[PDB]
Design a protein around this ligand. Sequence first.
Ligand SMILES: O=P(O)(O)O[C@H]1[C@H](O)[C@@H](OP(=O)(O)O)[C@H](OP(=O)(O)O)[C@@H](OP(=O)(O)O)[C@H]1O
Ligand SMILES: O=P(O)(O)O[C@H]1[C@H](O)[C@@H](OP(=O)(O)O)[C@H](OP(=O)(O)O)[C@@H](OP(=O)(O)O)[C@H]1O
Ligand SMILES: O=P(O)(O)O[C@H]1[C@H](O)[C@@H](OP(=O)(O)O)[C@H](OP(=O)(O)O)[C@@H](OP(=O)(O)O)[C@H]1O
Lengths: 590, 590
Amino acid sequence: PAVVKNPPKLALKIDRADVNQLPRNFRMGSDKYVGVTKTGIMPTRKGMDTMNVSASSCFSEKELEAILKKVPVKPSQFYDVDLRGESHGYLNGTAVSWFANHDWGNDGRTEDIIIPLEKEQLASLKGSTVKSIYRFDDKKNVILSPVYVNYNKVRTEEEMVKQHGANYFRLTLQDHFRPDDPDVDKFLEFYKSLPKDAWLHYHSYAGMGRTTIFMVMHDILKNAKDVSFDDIIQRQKLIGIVDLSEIPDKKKNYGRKAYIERYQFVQHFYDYVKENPDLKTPYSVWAKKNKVNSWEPDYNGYIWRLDTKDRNQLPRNFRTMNSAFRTDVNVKKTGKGFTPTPTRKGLDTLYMSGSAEFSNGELQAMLPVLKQQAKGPIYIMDLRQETHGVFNGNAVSWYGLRDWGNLGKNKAEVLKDENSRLNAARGKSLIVAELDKDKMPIDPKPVKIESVMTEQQLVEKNGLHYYRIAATDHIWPSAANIDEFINFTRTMPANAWLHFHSQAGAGRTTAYMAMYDMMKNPDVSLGDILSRQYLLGGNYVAYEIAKPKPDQWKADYYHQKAHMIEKFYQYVQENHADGFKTSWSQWLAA
Amino acid sequence: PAVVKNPPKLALKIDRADVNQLPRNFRMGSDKYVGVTKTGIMPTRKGMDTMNVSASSCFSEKELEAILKKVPVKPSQFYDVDLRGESHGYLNGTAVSWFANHDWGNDGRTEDIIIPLEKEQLASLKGSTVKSIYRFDDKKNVILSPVYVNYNKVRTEEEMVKQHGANYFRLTLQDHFRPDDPDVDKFLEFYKSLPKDAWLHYHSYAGMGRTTIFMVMHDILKNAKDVSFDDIIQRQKLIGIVDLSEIPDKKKNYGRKAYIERYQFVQHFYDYVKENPDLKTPYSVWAKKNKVNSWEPDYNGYIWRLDTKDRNQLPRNFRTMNSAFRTDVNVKKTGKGFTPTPTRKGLDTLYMSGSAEFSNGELQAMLPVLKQQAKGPIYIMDLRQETHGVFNGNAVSWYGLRDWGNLGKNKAEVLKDENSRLNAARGKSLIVAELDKDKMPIDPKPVKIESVMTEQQLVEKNGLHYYRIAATDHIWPSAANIDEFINFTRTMPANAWLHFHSQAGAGRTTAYMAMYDMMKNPDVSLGDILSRQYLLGGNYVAYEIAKPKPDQWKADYYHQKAHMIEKFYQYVQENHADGFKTSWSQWLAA
Ligand SMILES: O=P(O)(O)O[C@H]1[C@H](O)[C@@H](OP(=O)(O)O)[C@H](OP(=O)(O)O)[C@@H](OP(=O)(O)O)[C@H]1O
Ligand SMILES: O=P(O)(O)O[C@H]1[C@H](O)[C@@H](OP(=O)(O)O)[C@H](OP(=O)(O)O)[C@@H](OP(=O)(O)O)[C@H]1O
Ligand SMILES: O=P(O)(O)O[C@H]1[C@H](O)[C@@H](OP(=O)(O)O)[C@H](OP(=O)(O)O)[C@@H](OP(=O)(O)O)[C@H]1O
């Protein structure tokens, strides 16, 4: 085949043709040494034969079958450790993946974007039984002219491996680099939970870099006590293909840094296992204390943000389902299904409103409006995961990078963090600043904090009910968070009026409003729901960035929203009839 | 101007037009804060006003004059700290440099290569008063359409700066990265040697990355005891342009790694100054001990190499000036000035030979041949810096990466290492292996070491004189090594017969043979000298790699040879008449 001159940015290509054989770079930990060391002296073989470990390149289905046959365990004892962060899967037995330059198809992405993205990519191939798929040169890592692949099955690696009765574990590691600390932590917690008779097979794309790092880690976990670091590095080269201590002349600038980085990593992991033979202190914790940690963003709050100043007027982005459509329509901020003239059916009895966060003054202005229109009890639905409250009548929040001050916290932890920080602020003189477009404070000055309430205290004091869902800013509400809302709707009083707010009354607020609208009016089209929620003053839930630039970190998260809001529409179509007896989480998991 | 679609791999372009002004990103350590921090809280200014420091982008001559006028010291107190590893200089007052993609013109090169290479690049412009020079866009860092520049002066930055009565210090740092540990050590020895009233001006190309790293280091050296790491980082952003703690969303994969690497560097440097306020322990030594050191190659010997087996035949590549011209001429391994029919004028009375290293058996075969041709005392001129000797009649050496086992050592240290290691080998059972094309041992097996001698003992025991010059393998003989040979010729007998040898009888041997040939026959052309030394069985001293690939690390060293052998030719022309009274070192420095 011929090299493809201008390949797409992301090309679906063949990883492994389906052939009855052991795959590329296959080795078992008990294999004999091949080749020599630079000194001519062989490293001790101590501990090698009882490691119960093998490794290789990625594999087709027939190559997996050859692996399973060869290893001296049953499938039930076999764990496929899939180190590939790049999106991949199977068409029948043929292994395919989505390739970008340097094999960085999922460059920068976290596991929780990569896993569902990969399923979607693969899902897009179902409903066809033949496809032109690029070939690939492993020597130069470049796209070659395509062949047609026939198939009637599309599977993730997990599905294929489990259908063979084996076990599966995924780490989404970028090609060319060491695992970051949290992925080391994740591996170790998996490792510690293994049955003693477990057989581990590590693989990446080529069974070279990422694979050898983990073969070295494995050897260290079994043998660091009795075997030197240097011997481990050498012996994993002798039975394999890569010497992690080799920084060759041909590697320069960036590539050279990465070879250096991953060599240093295995040195630090060796030291960690040596000092912590019980594996009690997590690697990330040990590494931080010893200043050899990988870098991670810190999302913790570091400033009191002024969300909204105490003012006698309706809060920003306020609307009810009786409101007028907006006149400032921007089609470029809409998306799939958008119409300027959606049906208003059901809106007169939906009893729903939304807005940005509210100061005391803004709550006072909302009160008569909502009571004017409400036919039953009024609930303020606070959708904010981030810690917030009221200082001197002003709405404030504890702002961290990306507004992810409470990322990873459950509801109980959120409320505990919230109460604690608000209390601690009482009577202090603190910076409370509005943030500009760059999230930098504007004219920051200390101000004396005289009064401090939670929003709940404020809301209940004014005769309304309160409910909190801790939804993370910028992202599609989690399954748990959506289930919490559905459960809420099942028991809420009839004629209840729901007022949703988040920080800006945009992303999270419009998402929940659209989900509730759908639930109550399943006969209205997805596009009409999204369109009217937009027209009434929300954003468009299915917005996607046309041509994402590198600094546009929200791109994947908008895409996830666009995708998941459609799914949720389907969920409603299928479960509204019997009152949603089946949950969103259970439905997803089927 | 217009972007250049396909610029040359290396393009001479304009850095700074000559303008009367302070340069880009100019700041002084005592400057006021501009902008805000993310918390809205400003860092202490403690110690800022007494640091006696400024920083900026690179500067034109007039921009330097603006700098000198602005700062509150005399030029004699001002130190230009030039952080640029890329080759640069001055045409009249205009700053110019040689640009490759990512500003990596000298990617991978050491200071010893870059400094003389830069002077050579600038020297190539001195035979003109006008040049077409590319323009440059600082926003995108890309070459733009060229303009003509007129000049009658070509200068290094050092020359331009010293001509204004100021001081100069150079570190050859690659753009985009932190400094490696040895450059930190070099900066520190410089810093500690400063007078108290010294004023430091740091600059790189943009006054952004490398410059801010060093401004932070300075602030740390002055203020670590009293000011926190975070405050230093913030305040250097506030008076400047870069926050080293910021890893922006737009930086991905490789670029991201570099930002991370340099942030972590300034953290480690902080800790080092905090822990070592006396700056006694070097940074590199502290960093190693704490496992946060940058990676450096290790050139130390790790194996006994079999250089040549004891055998009853002339040593490899043996030749005298009465030897036949070779029949296997390969023009592609020749170079500038090659002729297949050079004069043999002077060879009849040039009492010289050369070969590869010799075993005992090969020395015995040599003896009658040399004694046949010699008209005076015979001297064996051992040119090897690397440690070697004789085991059981075989020539052996202590081999390290690149055969640089004794890199950096003086002659006394080389001989001390040599005696020590040879003695320690006696009676031991050790690996003594021939190395393959990849420098890996062939069929290594331990052998009993029964007899051990230095080459000097072997030679003198056979009634010959010995002299040692510790020349590093692969590279052009140093100035001190050439002077040492010249001093030898000045005190040796008229009709002394010199037999040069190294490991292979190629690079070092042929260079010294060509240098002596020139000295004794200054009326023979450079080309003829190099050509006949090649034809008699040496290599071609002025060989350069045509189109050097990334793995061909010797490229720069061959170029250095090709260059310096011509220079030595000129030295001979200018100094043979009086018997080389002025040394090579003195003549180079003028
Ligand atoms: O081609 P061979 O001699 O087998 O070696 C290759 C080339 O040097 C590649 O460079 P190039 O793209 O110039 O061919 C290099 O990728 P980089 O260019 O990214 O350094 C590979 O590094 P790894 O991809 O790390 O194996 C290295 O293994
Ligand atoms: O709080 P909800 O109602 O979900 O709405 C969010 C917040 O207003 C975000 O503000 P912040 O990030 O300051 O908390 C905003 O980010 P920007 O102001 O950076 O755009 C989001 O814009 P998009 O993520 O672009 O939709 C918006 O959807
Ligand atoms: O264009 P602006 O917004 O100024 O930001 C630039 C771009 O992101 C560059 O990327 P691109 O080449 O895609 O334009 C990037 O170089 P990399 O591509 O090496 O990341 C620069 O990093 P620095 O070179 O470190 O400034 C960064 O400052």
